[PDB]
Structures are given as C-alpha cells and as structure tokens.
Ligand binder design. Structure first.
Ligand SMILES: C[N+](C)(C)CCOP(=O)(O)O
Ligand SMILES: C[N+](C)(C)CCOP(=O)(O)O
Ligand SMILES: [Zn+2]
Ligand SMILES: [Zn+2]
Ligand SMILES: [Zn+2]
Ligand SMILES: [Zn+2]
Ligand SMILES: [Zn+2]
Ligand SMILES: [Zn+2]
Ligand SMILES: [Zn+2]
Ligand SMILES: [Zn+2]
Ligand SMILES: [Zn+2]
Ligand SMILES: [Zn+2]
Lengths: 142, 142
C-alpha cells in the first residue's frame, strides 16, 4: 500500500470538478434562456407610456447581479463536492451535505429567476399588467 | 499504432454518458421537486368546498401521463446522443441534431410543468384562487 490512492482520489476529485463545471453551465442556461425570451416578449407586447422602462432596467441590473452571486455560490458548492469526494470517494455525511448544498444553489437560481419574473410585472401599471398576463398565456399554451 | 484510439473514443463516450446522466437527473429533479412541494402546499393551504378536488385529481393524472411521455422522449434523445458520439466522436450533423433534441425535451418538460401549475389554479373558485396566490408569494420569497 502506497500514496497511490492519495493520487487516484485526487483524479476522482478533479474529474468530478470538470463534470460539475459543465452541468453548472447547463444549469445557468436552463434558467437564463427562458428569461431572455420572456424579456424580449415583454418589450414587444407591453408598452411604457408612464416610463416604467426607467424602473424595470434598474430591477433587471439588480437581478443580473443576484444571478451572478448565486452562480458563484454554485461553483463554490461544486468545488466543495469535488474536494470532499477527493477525500473519501463514497456516500459519506461529507458528500451527503455537499450534494444537498449543490441542489440548493441550483434551486435558489431557478427560484430567484421566478421571483424576478413576478417582481418585474409588479412594477407595471395595471393597464399593462393585464396585457403582460394575456401574452404569457398565448405563448406558453401555443 | 494500436486500438488506443478505439478505447480513447470509448472514454469520450463514457464521459459524455456520465455528463448526460447527471444533467438528466438535474432536469427530472428541477421540475418534480418544486411541483411536489407546490402540490402539498395547495392541499394544506387551499380548500375545496365546491369539490374542485374531483376535477383537480383528474387534471393531475392527465399531467403525470404527459410528464411520463416527455420523460421517455428525453431518455431516448440522450440515448440517440450516446449512440451518435459512439459512431463519430465530434460535432457532426448527427450530434448537432441529437444535442438540440435533448435541449428540446428538457425545455418541453419544464414548460409542461409550468403550464400545468396555471392550468390547476384555473380550475379553482375565485375565493380559493386568491388564497392559492397569497400562499405562492409567502413561500417563494421566504
Ligand atoms: C444516509 N441516508 C440514507 C439516511 C440519507 C441520505 O439521503 P438519501 O440518499 O436518502 O436521499
Ligand atoms: C444553427 N445550426 C446549429 C443549425 C447550424 C450551425 O452550425 P454549428 O455552429 O452548430 O456547427
Ligand atoms: Zn427580466
Ligand atoms: Zn398603455
Ligand atoms: Zn426619470
Ligand atoms: Zn429590458
Ligand atoms: Zn432535492
Ligand atoms: Zn400539480
Ligand atoms: Zn402538508
Ligand atoms: Zn372557501
Ligand atoms: Zn392531489
Ligand atoms: Zn439552448
């Protein structure tokens, strides 16, 4: 027996890190892609005669920042999972916790996008809110 | 000089298979987990004094069926991607198509869950719709 396992585990660690990095890119796309189309949909269908555009653009910049910080937390959670499997490559309490922590960051990204979507429609004049709701139904169903 | 490439490609194959396996698990969880909690949340917070329970249970059974069929399409799309890279391990038209097909199945799963969620609240008495909306805000934000 030698430091052979102490380098095989390091490989397992590095390998899971890369796997996670890619999955993480898919996670960030599975949330941003629908939000981007929904944003273009808002500009094309809903007006701004009381200049809600002023308010909305700030709200979006605030969201992109929160999005960036959850994204960072997800890279760190994946990193702690990569490092924990590099210590003990099995379902230990260390991995159990590190996995749930990845699931949480991924969920908190999807939840934050979802709250932003309703936060955006909140900052709209009732006349426009009805038009925003009517275009949501028309696009999701068809 | 040897079947070295015929085992390097097999590594590429196995590696993409693991990537896909994880992505797939994330996809099935990113949709089911919120829906399950949202369903329990409906039963605990919203009543049924006009027996909407009768209607809703049928709507859910119809959804679980559509969910099962999109889920099957996603396993088949991942399978055709696994088999195509096993033929030519590069960005060929075969892979180009098979990848877009995986993306579509994943999106169609998330979209179907989302439409179901609004389809469920549609079949509710206005008195209950307001209670269902008030509990959604309280749970997502906090
Ligand atoms: C070890 N354990 C089985 C009790 C908990 C680990 O979580 P899970 O594998 O049941 O999701
Ligand atoms: C747009 N497209 C995916 C159909 C073709 C573009 O080619 P490629 O950039 O995927 O190689
Ligand atoms: Zn937005
Ligand atoms: Zn107007
Ligand atoms: Zn101004
Ligand atoms: Zn904008
Ligand atoms: Zn979970
Ligand atoms: Zn439901
Ligand atoms: Zn309950
Ligand atoms: Zn009632
Ligand atoms: Zn039920
Ligand atoms: Zn895409």
């Amino acid at each position: 027996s030698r430091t052979f396992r102490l380098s095989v585990s390091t490989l397992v660690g590095a390998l899971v890190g890369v796997l996670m990095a890619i999955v993480g890119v898919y996670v960030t796309h599975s949330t941003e892609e629908p939000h981007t189309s929904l944003h273009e949909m808002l500009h094309d269908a809903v007006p701004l005669d009381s200049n809600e555009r002023e308010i909305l653009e700030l709200k979006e910049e605030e969201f992109t920042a929160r999005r960036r910080e959850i994204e960072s937390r997800l890279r760190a959670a994946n990193g702690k999972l990569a490092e924990s499997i590099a210590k003990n490559p099995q379902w230990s309490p260390e991995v159990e916790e590190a996995t749930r922590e990845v699931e949480r960051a991924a969920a908190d990204l999807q939840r934050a996008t979802l709250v932003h979507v309703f936060e955006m429609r909140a900052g709209l004049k009732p006349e426009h809110r009805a038009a925003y709701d009517r275009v949501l139904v028309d696009a999701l169903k068809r």
